[PDB]
């Protein structure tokens, strides 16, 4: 763990962030309605768009289509071609805020999680048709993520203090995880490797929890953040967990011992979002930062 500072820049509050898989680019989506795509090696903006006047809380690359997809508090999903800058689709996806967007790794599917208490599946090869609504949660759906080892299933994290895991094509959850994080679930992520059936959740109750999704048990609890924990993720290649919080810090936890290894206060106020490519990137109140670990 030699943490090197690749590229930071100040901006309005960064609510979403994503790495491009083949280009050295980071996408940020801002509370001001702007999105930015930065080449973090050369430190030049590849493209910027004033998408709306409302916060844009969710954004992802869809690399195989040369798109970004974003979702904003104006209720709308929009898709832009990052090479030409042109908007390719623009539709009202939910009658409320869009918190989270996930892209299926091999099929033309996108999920959106909303304050309307639902997750919705859209198919871009079927004219962006609504293919299914997953109803069940009792509060805002804050995060949605496919299972990378089985993307026919996905998890939703919700302020109703639960995580629900669903199968595409089925109306009810495969199971519902009672987190015990009584201030709600802000984020949910899968561990990517096949040796552990692990998921991780972050909460305003200052805890981070690891879950065995076969037995539905809590494997460990990571404590130490001083304020709401906005996200927690497994690193794809390093045996570490990365979290960020409104206490202004990133924390890197040992993924074997579940103990904190490093606490980074990057000086940009509250942390809100995370991406991993050993690059990681995080979005904050006052900008973003791209960090190399090895």
């Amino acid at each position: 763990l030699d943490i090197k500072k690749t590229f930071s820049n100040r901006s309005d509050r960064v609510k979403g962030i994503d790495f491009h898989p083949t280009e050295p680019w980071v996408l940020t989506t801002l509370y001001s309605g702007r999105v930015e795509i930065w080449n973090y090696e050369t430190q030049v903006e590849v493209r910027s768009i004033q998408v709306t006047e409302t916060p844009v809380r969710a954004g992802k690359f869809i690399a195989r289509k040369n798109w970004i997809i974003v979702g904003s508090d104006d209720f709308r999903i929009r898709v832009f071609n990052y090479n030409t800058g042109e908007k390719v689709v623009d539709f009202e996806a939910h009658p409320d805020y869009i918190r989270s967007i996930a892209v299926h790794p091999t099929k033309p599917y996108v999920l959106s999680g909303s304050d309307d208490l639902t997750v919705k599946l859209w198919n871009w090869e079927n004219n962006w048709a609504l293919e299914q609504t997953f109803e069940g949660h009792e509060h805002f759906v804050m995060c949605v993520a496919f299972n990378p080892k089985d993307p026919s299933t996905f998890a939703s994290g919700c302020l109703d203090r639960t995580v629900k895991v669903w199968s595409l094509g089925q109306s009810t959850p495969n199971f519902t995880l009672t987190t015990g994080q009584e201030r709600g679930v802000n984020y949910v992520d899968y561990y990517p490797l096949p040796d552990k059936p692990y998921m991780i959740t972050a909460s305003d109750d200052l805890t981070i929890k690891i879950w065995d999704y076969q037995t539905k048990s809590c494997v460990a609890t990571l404590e130490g953040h001083m304020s709401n924990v906005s996200f927690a993720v497994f690193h794809p290649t390093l045996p570490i967990i990365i979290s960020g919080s409104e206490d202004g810090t990133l924390k890197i936890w040992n993924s074997s011992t579940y103990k904190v290894e490093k606490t980074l206060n990057v000086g940009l106020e509250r942390s809100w979002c995370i991406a991993t490519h050993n690059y990681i990137a995080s979005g904050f109140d006052n900008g973003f930062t791209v960090l190399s670990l090895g």
């Binding site: 509050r13 509370y31 304050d115 805002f140 804050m142 302020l159 802000n186 509250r270």
Partner: peptide
């Protein structure tokens, strides 16, 4: 609302 920031 709840999580507006």
């Amino acid at each position: 609302k709840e999580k507006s920031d």
